Design a protein around this ligand. Structure first.
Ligand SMILES: N[C@H](CNc1nc(-c2ccncc2)nc2sc3c(c12)CCCC3)Cc1ccccc1
Ligand SMILES: [Cl-]
Length: 320
């Protein structure tokens, strides 16, 4: 099926330790896509045994939702896995906050709404995102958000289920994870609380003036206080999403969790349905505005365990 031959490696658009993301062009179609590349050796050594399976499953659910990147195709070389993904060209919230420094409540309200719809959808599908942060919140040309990089997702969580992996991006990691407690969807809502805080305050609730051990101490012990300039509505949601007790945290009620959010005074006057069909207009249009592969290690590749990657190839019959 697909392979590197069928593509033109245009540029690099993302680079972590585990994963690398390229901008690519499907030759025979002249369409542009984003490509996520990961060394299969690290997939075996660093990830849960069902990582490949969880990724494929998550992309499936994401193709049927407006605020989630969908999967075009994926293939494998001897040493790497390749995820060809719907391309988003509006940048991300981090880039936006970089120029904005601080967003009006209306803007944060909009974004946090769309983010909630994407999250609740994953939760409904028994999935925990587990890595919501500014730069994982992409923006399309129109100005709507899109969650990307599903590398941290947990799958198959039934009602009452609970997982126990310590993961995430330190600044956004929930207290219940820090305590080593079994957790569920609650971590995602805490993450949104932290993200909402950055949007409206212009800084993290845990900014300063063992560096990471100290950060974890701040999150667990230091009292979270909302700045005096924010409205009573805003102060509430922040404090509610940022409740260190998963049981008492906003959006975490097993039954009325997501209803409690939509009902929150902060989200008053929000048409969720129109929000979900993109019938609500974004407060910022990235358009009209603003401003190669590492060689394999033959001694490693030769001994790689290809088991988990058998039958990895795939193409989506419906263009995401
Ligand atoms: N944070 C953006 C660049 N990084 C990434 N962008 C996208 C992406 C997906 C779809 N359309 C666009 C981007 N997906 C991913 S998955 C991943 C990373 C990443 C980096 C860390 C490792 C895992 C910022 C950015 C936005 C737009 C263009 C270039 C960069
Ligand atoms: Cl507190």
């Amino acid at each position: 099926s697909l392979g590197l031959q069928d593509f033109d490696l245009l540029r690099v658009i993302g680079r972590g330790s585990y994963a690398k993301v390229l901008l690519v062009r499907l030759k025979k179609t002249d369409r542009i896509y984003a490509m996520k590349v990961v060394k299969k050796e690290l997939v075996n050594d660093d990830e849960d045994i069902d990582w490949v399976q969880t990724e494929k499953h998550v992309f499936e659910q994401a193709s049927n939702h407006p605020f989630l990147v969908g999967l075009h195709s994926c293939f494998q070389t001897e040493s790497r896995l390749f995820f060809v993904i719907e391309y988003v060209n509006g940048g991300d919230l981090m880039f936006h906050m970089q120029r904005q420094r601080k967003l009006p409540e209306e803007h944060a309200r909009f974004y946090s709404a769309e983010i909630s719809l994407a999250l609740n959808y994953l939760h409904e599908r028994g999935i925990i995102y587990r890595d919501l942060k500014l730069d994982n919140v992409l923006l399309d040309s129109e100005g709507h958000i899109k969650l990307t990089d599903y590398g941290m997702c947990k799958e198959g969580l039934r009602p009452g289920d609970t997982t126990s992996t310590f993961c995430g991006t330190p600044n956004y990691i929930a207290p219940e994870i820090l305590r080593g407690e079994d957790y569920g969807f609650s971590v995602d809502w805490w993450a949104l609380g932290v993200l909402m805080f950055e949007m409206m305050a212009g800084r993290s609730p845990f900014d300063i003036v063992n560096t990471e051990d100290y950060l974890f101490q701040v999150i667990l012990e230091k009292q979270i206080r909302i700045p005096r300039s924010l409205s009573v509505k805003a102060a509430s949601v922040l404090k509610s999403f940022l409740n260190k007790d998963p049981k008492e945290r906003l959006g975490c009620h097993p039954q009325t969790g997501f209803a409690d959010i939509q009902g929150h005074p902060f989200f008053r006057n929000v048409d969720w349905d129109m929000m979900e069909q993109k019938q609500v207009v974004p407060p910022f249009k990235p358009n009209i505005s603003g401003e190669q592969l590492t060689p394999d290690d033959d001694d490693i590749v030769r001994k790689i365990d290809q088991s988990e990657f058998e039958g990895f190839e795939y193409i989506n019959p419906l263009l995401m």
